């Protein structure tokens, strides 16, 4: 049906922290909750019955298939055919007892890189009739917790369970750099909008930035809880960080101030910016998918799921959101403007 906006309100949940600081609730500008490219609501349109907890989700480009990472395998679902209740293929990646933790498409959509609770990352050719393993990257760290691909498609970064960030030349499957610094597992990763900086979160309560050309750590932010997720605003300036403590913090990159956002009751497991950068989502162990205005975090929508929300992805045109669940499924939403 047609839906209409209906305004709600909460005790103040979004705070601006200054250099002092000095936390003041944010006075939302007129285009905080409504405007061009700002979602009106989101509607659930599919449920993908993976049958194991879904630690990683990715949507194809063009949007057509969804990849869900569970135990042992990635399942491929054709969401363009409405009636399908089962995957159209399955990518068997690691020990059946071990979880896939991250999967990423190359910018051009023809290859998927999969990492998880094993020392090998598999690289999958998606053109070949039935999908097949093209190559493997064999780390000496026991697990990968998060992957990122460079925008030029040449490199894959792997967040290792030892805290190291591995940088892999995809052409010849060689480790070309290793970023050392995190003293506990690196849990999350993104790349700056100009492609030159890497940003990582860790179970050592830090966010680190790394110069990709020079190879060195640039910045370190220390927090009072573990970092589980992060995302760099595609239009720059802002880094969103989701915490074990339930806070989302939006850091002003190379600046003194930040926002602290309080609409989760538990760990912020994952986060993703829309491609337009004007809003982002966070998912919680408290079962919530939250949509937020960039940078100051006005609440655009909330969707409560049946179980913890481990993972998420947003389609290239910002039309769909997919989340992965502790209830052993993924959920496809249409974003309604």
């Amino acid at each position: 049906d047609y839906f209409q906006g209906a305004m709600g309100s909460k005790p103040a949940y979004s705070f601006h922290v200054t250099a002092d600081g000095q936390m003041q609730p944010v006075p939302f500008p007129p285009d905080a909750l409504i405007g061009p490219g700002i979602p009106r609501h989101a509607r659930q349109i599919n449920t993908l019955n993976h049958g194991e907890v879904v630690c990683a989700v990715t949507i194809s480009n063009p949007t057509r298939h969804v990849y869900t990472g569970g135990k042992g395998c990635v399942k491929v679902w054709d969401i363009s055919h409405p009636g399908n209740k089962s995957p159209v293929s399955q990518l068997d990646c690691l020990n059946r007892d071990n979880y896939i933790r991250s999967c990423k498409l190359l910018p051009d959509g023809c290859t998927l890189i999969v990492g998880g609770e094993a020392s090998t990352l598999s690289i999958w050719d998606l053109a070949a009739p039935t999908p097949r393993i093209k190559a493997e990257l064999t780390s000496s760290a026991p697990a990968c917790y998060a992957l990122a691909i460079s925008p030029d498609s040449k490199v894959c970064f792997s967040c290792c369970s030892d805290g190291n960030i591995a940088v892999w030349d995809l052409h010849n499957q060689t480790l070309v750099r290793q970023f050392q610094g995190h003293t506990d597992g690196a849990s999350c990763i993104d790349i700056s909008n100009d492609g030159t900086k890497l940003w990582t979160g860790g179970l050592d309560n830090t966010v680190r930035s790394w110069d990709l050309r020079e190879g060195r750590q640039l910045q370190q932010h220390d927090f009072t809880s573990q970092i589980f997720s992060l995302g760099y605003c595609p239009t720059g300036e802002w880094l969103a960080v989701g915490m074990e403590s339930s806070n989302v913090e939006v850091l002003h990159v190379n600046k003194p101030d930040k926002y602290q956002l309080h609409l989760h009751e538990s760990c912020v497991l994952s986060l993703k910016f829309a491609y337009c950068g004007k809003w982002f989502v966070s998912t919680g162990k408290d079962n919530l998918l939250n949509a937020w205005r960039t940078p100051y975090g006005a609440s655009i929508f909330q969707s409560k799921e049946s179980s913890s929300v481990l993972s998420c992805d947003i389609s290239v045109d910002d039309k769909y959101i997919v989340t992965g669940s502790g209830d052993k499924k993924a959920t496809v939403y249409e974003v309604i403007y």
């Binding site: 071990n98 609770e117 697990a143 369970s161 179970l203 497991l269 502790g326």
Partner: peptide, 5 residues
């Protein structure tokens, strides 16, 4: 293995 969920 670290698993946050």
């Amino acid at each position: 293995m670290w698993r946050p969920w």
